[PDB]
Amino acid sequence: MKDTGIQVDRDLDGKSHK
Amino acid sequence: MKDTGIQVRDLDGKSHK
Amino acid sequence: MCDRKAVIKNADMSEEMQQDSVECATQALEKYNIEKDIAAHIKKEFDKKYNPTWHCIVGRNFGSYVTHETKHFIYFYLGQVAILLFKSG
Amino acid sequence: MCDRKAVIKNADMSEEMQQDSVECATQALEKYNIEKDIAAHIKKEFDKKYNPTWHCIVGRNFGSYVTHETKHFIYFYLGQVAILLFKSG
């Protein structure tokens, strides 16, 4: 089995807010 | 067997907390 | 007009499954519009049809690590939110 | 170089396991200080010792759904970041 790896952290704050 | 459920707050950032 | 959007990043599964997940995820947003719920819908729907166990992740700032057999792994951003899905067995 | 508060919320695993994960997680921060890296090293260690397959996620803004065998689930906040760990087999 292949180990999935990721690290999301998009600064899509823009006008609104994450 | 049981399906885990979650939905994570700006603990730390620009505003700082 | 938009249909079957979402950008692929970690493709690794049958075209139908990946396209169904993307479309299925899109609907989830339309019906719930919540990263948490999105995983719930796609999770049970696939586990029921394709059989478990499909793991799902959705958000906009989170580190993840998991294991999975070959030909069962997919990841793609959509609706200003990253989505992940892949069965395990 | 081991002690750490960390709050538990979804306790669902042997005390020692959860304690080892919490303590092991602490070391991860000091050794790596990264949500992804921490989850990677800790996941492998537990799989090797307790046997696969452990799933780990860490961050502070993400919705998710996953399946797992009984007594194989744990969740707790620490280091200003939500920590998740749970094996399946």
From Swiss-Prot, chains C, D:
Gene3D superfamilies: Protein Inhibitor Of Neuronal Nitric Oxide Synthase. One of its GO terms (molecular function) is protein domain specific binding. Its main location: cytoplasm. The keyword S-adenosyl-L-methionine does not apply. One of its GO terms (biological process) is apoptotic process. InterPro entries: DLC_sf, Dynein_light_1/2_CS, Dynein_light_chain_typ-1/2. Keywords: Acetylation, Activator, Apoptosis, Chromosome, Cytoplasm, Cytoskeleton, DNA damage, Dynein, Isopeptide bond, Microtubule, Mitochondrion, Motor protein, Nucleus, Phosphoprotein, Transcription, Transcription regulation, Transport, Ubl conjugation. It is found in: Cytoplasm, Cytoskeleton, Microtubule organizing center, Centrosome; Chromosome; Cytoplasm, Cytoskeleton; Nucleus. GO terms for cellular component: axon cytoplasm; centrosome; cilium; COP9 signalosome; cytoplasm; cytoplasmic dynein complex; cytoskeleton; cytosol. Coiled coil: none annotated. Weaker expression in the cerebellum and spinal cord compared with other brain regions. CDD domains: DLC-like_DYNLL1_DYNLL2. Pfam families: Dynein_light. Residues 67-89 are annotated as: Interaction with ESR1. Phosphorylation at Ser-88 promotes recruitment to DNA double-strand breaks (DSBs) by TP53BP1 and ability to inhibit MRE11. The modification N6-acetyllysine is found at K36. There is a cross-link at K43 (Glycyl lysine isopeptide (Lys-Gly) (interchain with G-Cter in SUMO2)). Belongs to the dynein light chain family. Acts as one of several non-catalytic accessory components of the cytoplasmic dynein 1 complex that are thought to be involved in linking dynein to cargos and to adapter proteins that regulate dynein function. Cytoplasmic dynein 1 acts as a motor for the intracellular retrograde motility of vesicles and organelles along microtubules. May play a role in changing or maintaining the spatial distribution of cytoskeletal structures. In addition to its role in cytoskeleton and transport, acts as a protein-protein adapter, which inhibits and/or sequesters target proteins. Homodimer. Monomer; the monomeric form is incapable of binding to target proteins. The cytoplasmic dynein 1 complex consists of two catalytic heavy chains (HCs) and a number of non-catalytic subunits presented by intermediate chains (ICs), light intermediate chains (LICs) and light chains (LCs); the composition seems to vary in respect to the IC, LIC and LC composition. The heavy chain homodimer serves as a scaffold for the probable homodimeric assembly of the respective non-catalytic subunits. The ICs and LICs bind directly to the HC dimer and the LCs assemble on the IC dimer. This is Dynein light chain 1, cytoplasmic. It comes from Rattus norvegicus. The lineage of its organism: Eukaryota, Metazoa, Chordata, Craniata, Vertebrata.
